Design a protein around this ligand. Structure first.
Ligand SMILES: O=C1Cc2cc(-c3c(-c4ccc(F)cc4)nn4c(N5CCC(O)CC5)nccc34)ccc2N1
Ligand SMILES: O=C1Cc2cc(-c3c(-c4ccc(F)cc4)nn4c(N5CCC(O)CC5)nccc34)ccc2N1
Ligand SMILES: N[C@@H](CCC(=O)O)C(=O)O
Ligand SMILES: N[C@@H](CCC(=O)O)C(=O)O
Lengths: 398, 399, 182, 398, 399, 182
């Protein structure tokens, strides 16, 4: 009468209750898949006993023995009858067992250690303007000085090249120099330069607070290609899973390169459990990456300690699918149950409850580290000035 | 033996080739589903004859007659042996036909006509102040310069020309080579200084407000956003899975949406997706078509690409390949589909038919040279004018 | 000699421009719900519609009420009074007239050199009044659909520019006369 | 078997459905009171027929005939048995009928026409600084000029009083004057004045955008006392209601003055219906005010056209209370039903549905009207300067 | 015949007078309920003897024994004939005792310990920059002035004193009476100008950010805010109507709150309101007491008034006067209560006992002289120093 | 004469102050999780705890790793190298020493007047290096709990101030000598 239900403790899908030592029956298990199996048995009416797999593996086949492990081996070999689990659909497993319509969608993704926030760097004061603007500003400064020079030499009413550059520079920094033009042609240039400076400096000053205090989080890898290029950084997957099989059976160049690396990368990058990879990433100073389904990353990044992050997008798109052995009478009703739950919106509510409901993760005065680059520039200019003065002194003395 | 393939004419899944009249048969059609069926037949090893659903409706059931219309109607009643079209998967259809594993995902999505972008011009640095203020500033500058010249001269270096220079430098806060010594000139200077201070402070503050603001506000931005308002009417496609989804919903928001849609005068329901697309495009922001995310994205990408998707998908579901209940073709088709998904084929096809066309390519960010190029143009104009006046003065001095 | 004649013709041209703009009714080109809103070419006194049911019939304006008739003596009523009276543009015209008269009288009594000085002062004051008038005109119209300005607007502006130029020239004439006196 | 239910059409409590001509039975009425009566009959079990009062009045007594009108007269005289209505509790009505525990709380309040938003006024540029700051600024300007004057006369290394004022003024406006101090004592004053100006002008410029574009909505009346003081503005109440009785039976001075005004204010300020007062306020150019319960104002201000507003606070606090005739067996259970609904939270849900769910009600470039005052000041200064020059010319000529 | 009056010692409804030991009887007690009962007796025409509830618990039922404790216990079992205390009205109590019409309203409210105000000092205008920046600015000013003097002098008006003046005026952007003519001096000047520009722009921008920001963020700001977090524990008063309200709730949020409270280690439930008040006051922001709005407001008003109320009242209810079921006193009491409410009496009493004490009186708003007084003090200090130095120079010149 | 002696004593005082501050270890007064955080008086080289389990025992610092040991050659590693080496304060001390030496040697060879000029240049460069050193010291410590600075900090600051003053005086001496030369 009771149905043999297979599962694994892959949180938040299946996880034991606190102080479960005093818990007995199916009540000792809480999670998303336990709930799901509850409603499936309700709609179909059967009874179920929640059972874990001793091997603790999702499932795979051994290319030499042609034997099935984990849930797939259990269902094919008769040890059970159904798997309301986070089992992943794939071609190979369908050849031997009958899946349902997926109850949640996913994709492969990459897990890395969260880098320390990049404190804003020296020369941060150039950020609010694009480098092209700075280049055009320099060109305009040169051009204005040259035009003033030519105008005041050819048609005067003194403005050499040096003093013209000085005047333009002073005008740009809102400091008035001792000399001012006396000719209409020079005064027009002065006026337009003044207007230009007003506009540019106002624009620069407007958006300057943001670019000084913002810390940007940047990862060394921004996609899978960036990962394949970097050989020092190590990446691995669960030993027996749709991920390893997908990499092994792939035909794209990138994934084939990854597979060669993994098959040759000693020590074995492969782990035996998801939490093992979680700890390895959390305990490798950012020297390790883990490939896994996106749902687990979403759960983890939404849960403390929040010391890791998801990078990039999903390499492939798939879905978790309930499974049943070939020829079972349960297979037909489970599909309809899944569709009914999807239409009712139950699955979305469960997702929100077990993922979003578990979420666990300002004007500051400027720090001297924020504006130290301008001090460095200042002191460098002073040293340059003293050096130039010494050089002029020597030249004059000769 | 050829296998009938019922489909539907909805871009980009299926489309009519340019110069379709000249072409005939399957070679006339082209779209995502076409390549999908080609690959499926290649992997299975059979041949297929395309065919369209006459009604043009995806499929549904008449509650009175209890009959099936559309592609599902053709498949149930033996007309067509396969349906490669974007058939959304639901409980009701799955009872009578054997769906395959989904080959694409989607959700219920809201479309709106793209609002005015209000793109910024090269002279975007004058926006913080009205042109009226700028011109009245110029006129006040002239007036104050004249008054200064006057009060200073009649019973001094404060001629008209130097007065204009002084007042300009004061406005720009670049100092003065000369300053008034008289009482009247000093009053004029102080008042002009006050005016300059106020005006420049206002310009800078308003500019900071401008650059720290973007027009990201959405008209609705939520499903209940559609429900609350009434000026904009939201409706669906008749004989489409979303209509049933609203009809059988058990939520407050969906119940209200269904009540409004079923009691909407005139009929919000449209005959075809293009009908609703044009309705929103020609509704002057009065229609809010509800459809599938795929079509919404494609349309928001295609020129004029004057439509936008708003909010998050209400629910999640996917298309699927269908066969008649008891058909022998159900088995391998699933397998084929999976092959494609694991081979990247479907991803390549999606990218090709949704992104390659690329009609239009549409926190704090640095300023772009476009925002501030007008002042550069002004500078160049002033430099040229200065050279011209230098030439004129040279000629005058020579003669 | 030439300078005085240029002064006089400029003064009379400015007076004519300002009087035209005051009497003329093509200041503003806006849509209003006053004609069966619809395109309308307004003015300082009367608002005249076009491309509508009237297609040429038009009337004065109720500047003080504006159909509101509230908030009396609240620093906004004063603006309304000033706008309706249009006292400042009229003052500008009067000052231009008197300045031109003084310039002309200068030819009669060349000994009294202060006459042109008074004329220049009058022209400058006319410019100030003109700019105040346009400021209040624009500030009142705020009480947002498209709008635009007509050629009477620019006629008033040209009057102001001419007034400034003429003030400069008259002051220069006074300087020259006093210098010749020594 | 059926219960006689009395109500009135005071939205949103009771209001007819759209196209009710085709509606029959109790279904033609929708609102808050209809729902409430539904759950009350459910809990009590009885049946009800929703009936309106022909007189269309809540209830009151005639001081001469000692007769009861509206709902109170109906229930006392046997024409009905219960009133699930927006009836207001009071001493007088309790003496004759039995109320329940209030199902919603309220208070008297004042309704006025929404004034046109006050466009920011001339001299708006002084707003970002308190007038005390401006006074201290003027005093500091005077003091700095005087100190510079004394220092440069007594201990010089020219800075008269006039030129000292000019220098200080130029420093305040970020314009450098031709002369600069040459003595240490003067230069210290200059430095502190410069720092003062930097700080003050930066503070002023920081918060200047807000004070230029904000439109402030201000009402001529800000409370009941301000209403009593103003006799030109007219205020009235519903003719037969707890409000009129409360004013009539009051003993506080303010309310007694109001009662004298209403009893003498010709034409009769009193209305016959709430919508009558709504229209009268909406059709009096802000010359009329209406006194009514706060719930109706909250509903109206939350509903278009949104051409009116609530002003001040609630003069008195009361609650709406179901009523029943003396000795009725329904009275005991209706109290329990009300308490059960309150505990369950139904009443809050109904309130939110019928009040909040019905709610129906930016960087702009500066307009010349915003900064016209500074233009006026400028032109006035120019006129003053010309006048002063003429005066000096006349004085010199004599 | 005197009527027993059971009450409870909770301020400000009932309190013990200063020097209570000397006093005895009703004259020893003082609080809102005292005046309320006095007025009720005056309007009814009887005399009353005060008495306290020994247990000190408001009232509740033991689910096993099915007995009543507290003031309700005293009233049901004939101990006391009246209960003028703040008895919250509920369905369970109203079955057995005759409540009167409520004389005050309230709701479930959340208390928190008042966070640090971070009050702004007179020298609040230096806040946008670290003191480190200011002092390093001073040191850089000295260094650049010295370098300028040096480069200019050793083979000019650029002495050390004039160099300091020039660099100061450059930093303040007030111009210079003199400017460098040499290459080295001009390099120094340009670099100092760059530094000044960057630093002043940063100061102004950060100051604008400061003045357009206030610390209004609340730790929870909602009922579900308490549920989500776990560092702060929320509990109620045992034997208090709020405990039952949570116990019998049918909402998700209230169900979760009840689950947490009933399974809270250590016991969140407190013996008395002062217990929870002290728990939050000495929890270092670890306790979130749930109580009635009246007590929360009174406490947030009384010194130290270091506690704040957060969020809106979860539900609405009111106190009420109670009598035994079948008592003859029920009739007139209601009437009396209504009289008071219609006579403004209860409003006056509430205002007196909640606002008159006034221990502590705690969108864009103009700056207050307090924000910027430090610069005025600096100005006065500089003026005095200038006068002193003038005197010193006068003495030196004389000698 | 007096001025040269004041120069020399100021130079030696500045050198002593700077050397003390470098060798001394009472720069910063902060809490850290390095002693069984707890109050700690740190320094340029070694961090020494107080009022803790050690109550006087203390050790050097791992400036380059900081227990992170990541992001090499990224413009932050250079700051760490500079902070650890403390090359700039040491350079300031060296320059002060050499300047004092040149000043003293001036008394030996009064003919060569450029010696004091070199000394003044060295003092100014010492000031520049000192300010750079304090800047990098403060910038590195960022890598927020309470903190405070000790008397070695102000000793370095006083060294800088004296260096500036001495540079001024030496330049003035050079001016006087060259003027006397004529
Ligand atoms: O009696 C009057 C009337 C008047 C108008 C003006 C004037 C002018 C003007 C006038 C004459 C010219 F030859 C050139 C320009 N332009 N202008 C503007 N703007 C320019 C174009 C507009 O579309 C947008 C902003 N805003 C406000 C006022 C204004 C100046 C003085 C006077 N005195
Ligand atoms: O080798 C060194 C070390 C050093 C330190 C400094 C210094 C001084 C200082 C030094 C000596 C004095 F006589 C007076 C002041 N104060 N100061 C500050 N602040 C003042 C008080 C602090 O608590 C908050 C901000 N921030 C950063 C640096 C700094 C200047 C030069 C040098 N050169
Ligand atoms: N449930 C998945 C897990 C694989 C993985 O985590 O990579 C499977 O059966 O393959
Ligand atoms: N229901 C209230 C209405 C009174 C009013 O609106 O003023 C009553 O019975 O008095």
């Amino acid at each position: 009468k009771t149905v043999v239900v297979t599962t694994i403790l892959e949180s938040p899908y299946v996880m034991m209750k606190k102080n479960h030592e005093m818990l007995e029956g199916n009540e000792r298990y809480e999670g998303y898949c336990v709930d799901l199996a509850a409603e499936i048995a309700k709609h179909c009416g059967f009874k179920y006993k929640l059972t874990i797999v001793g091997d603790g593996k999702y499932g795979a086949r051994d290319a030499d023995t042609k034997i099935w492990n984990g849930m797939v081996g259990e269902l094919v070999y008769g040890k059970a009858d159904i798997a309301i689990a986070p089992l992943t659909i794939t071609l190979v497993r369908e050849e031997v067992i009958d899946f349902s319509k997926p109850f949640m969608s996913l994709g492969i993704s990459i897990m890395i250690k969260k880098p320390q926030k990049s404190k804003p760097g020296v020369f941060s004061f150039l950020d609010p303007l694009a480098y092209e603007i700075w280049m055009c500003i320099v060109f305009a400064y040169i051009g204005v000085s040259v035009v003033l020079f030519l105008v005041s030499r050819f048609s005067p009413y003194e403005f050499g090249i040096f003093n013209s550059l000085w005047f333009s520079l002073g005008a740009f920094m809102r400091q008035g120099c001792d000399i001012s033009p006396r000719s209409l042609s020079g005064r027009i240039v002065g006026g337009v330069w003044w207007f230009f400076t007003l506009i540019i400096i106002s624009s620069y000053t407007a958006n300057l607070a943001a670019f000084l205090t913002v810390e940007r989080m940047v990862s060394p890898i921004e996609s899978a290609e960036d990962l394949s290029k970097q050989t020092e950084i190590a990446y691995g997957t669960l030993d027996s899973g749709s991920t390893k099989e997908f990499f092994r059976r792939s035909k794209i160049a990138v994934f084939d390169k990854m597979w060669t690396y993994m098959r040759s990368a000693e020590p074995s990058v492969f782990v035996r459990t998801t939490a093992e990879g979680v700890a390895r990433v959390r305990k490798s100073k950012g020297k390790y990456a883990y490939l896994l389904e996106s749902t687990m990353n979403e759960y983890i990044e939404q849960r403390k300690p929040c010391d890791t992050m998801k990078v990039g997008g999903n390499l492939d798109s798939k879905g978790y699918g309930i499974a049943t052995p070939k020829g079972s009478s349960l297979g037909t009703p489970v599909n309809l149950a899944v569709l009914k739950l999807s239409e009712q919106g139950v699955l979305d509510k469960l997702k929100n409850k077990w993922w979003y409901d578990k979420g666990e993760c300002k004007t500051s005065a400027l720090s001297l580290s924020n504006v130290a680059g301008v001090f460095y520039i200042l002191v460098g200019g002073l040293g340059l000035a003293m050096l130039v003065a010494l050089i002029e002194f020597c030249y004059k003395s000769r | 033996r050829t296998y009938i393939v019922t489909t539907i004419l909805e871009d980009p899944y299926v489309m009519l080739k340019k110069n379709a009249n000249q072409f005939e048969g399957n070679d006339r059609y082209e779209g995502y589903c076409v390549e999908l069926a080609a690959e499926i037949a290649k992997h299975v090893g059979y041949s297929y004859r395309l065919e369209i659903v006459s009604d043009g409706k995806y499929g549904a059931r008449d509650p009175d007659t209890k009959a099936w219309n559309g592609m599902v109607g053709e498949l149930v009643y033996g007309r067509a042996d396969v349906a490669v079209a974007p058939l959304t998967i639901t409980l009701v259809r799955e009872e009578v036909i054997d769906f395959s594993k989904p080959f694409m995902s989607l959700g219920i999505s809201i479309m709106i006509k793209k609002p005015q972008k209000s793109k910024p011009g090269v002279f975007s640095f004058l926006d913080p102040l009205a042109y009226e203020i700028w011109m009245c500033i110029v006129f006040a500058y002239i007036g104050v310069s004249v008054v200064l010249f006057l009060v200073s001269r009649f019973s001094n270096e404060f001629g008209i020309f130097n007065s204009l220079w002084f007042s300009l430098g004061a406005f720009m806060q670049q100092g003065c080579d000369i300053s008034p010594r008289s009482l009247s000139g000093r009053i004029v200077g102080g008042v002009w200084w006050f005016f300059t201070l106020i005006i420049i402070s206002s310009y800078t503050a308003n500019l900071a407000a401008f650059l720290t603001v973007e027009r990201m506000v959405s008209p609705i931005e939520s499903a209940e956003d559609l429900a609350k308002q009434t000026e904009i009417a939201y409706g669906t496609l008749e004989a489409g899975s979303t209509k049933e989804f609203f009809r059988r919903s058990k939520i407050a928001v969906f119940e209200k949406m269904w009540t409004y849609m079923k009691s909407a005068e005139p009929s919000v329901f449209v005959r075809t997706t293009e009908e609703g697309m044009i309705r929103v495009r020609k509704s002057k922001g009065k229609y809010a078509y509800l459809l599938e995310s795929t079509m919404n994205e494609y349309i928001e990408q295609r020129k004029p690409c004057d439509t936008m998707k708003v909010g998050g998908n209400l629910d999640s579901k996917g298309y699927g390949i269908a066969t008649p209940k008891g058909s022998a073709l159900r088995g391998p088709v699933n397998l084929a589909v999976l092959k494609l998904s694991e081979q990247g084929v479907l991803d390549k096809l999606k990218s090709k038919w949704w992104y390659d066309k690329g009609e239009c390519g549409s926190k704090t960010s640095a300023l772009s040279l476009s925002n501030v190029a007008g002042v550069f143009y002004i500078l160049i104009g002033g430099l040229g004018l200065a050279m011209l006046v230098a030439l004129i003065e040279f000629c005058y001095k020579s003669r | 000699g030439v300078q005085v004649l240029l002064t006089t013709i400029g003064a009379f041209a400015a007076f004519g421009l300002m009087t035209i703009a005051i009497s003329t009714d093509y200041w503003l080109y806006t849509r209003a719900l006053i004609c069966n809103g619809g395109l309308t070419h307004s003015g300082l006194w009367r608002i005249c519609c076009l491309e509508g049911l009237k297609r040429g019939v038009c009337v004065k304006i109720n500047h003080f009420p504006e159909d509101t008739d509230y908030d009396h003596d609240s620093a906004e009523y004063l603006l309304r009074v000033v706008r309706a009276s249009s006292i400042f543009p009229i003052l500008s015209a009067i000052l231009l007239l008197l300045g031109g008269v003084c310039v002309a009288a200068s030819r009669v009594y060349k000994s009294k050199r202060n006459i042109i000085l008074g004329a220049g002062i009058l022209f400058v004051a006319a410019g100030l009044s003109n700019i105040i008038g346009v400021i209040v005109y624009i500030s009142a119209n705020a009480g947002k659909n498209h709008y635009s300005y007509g050629w009477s607007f620019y006629f008033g502006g040209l009057s102001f520019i001419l007034a400034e130029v003429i003030g400069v020239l008259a002051v220069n004439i006074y300087i020259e006369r006093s210098r010749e006196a020594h």
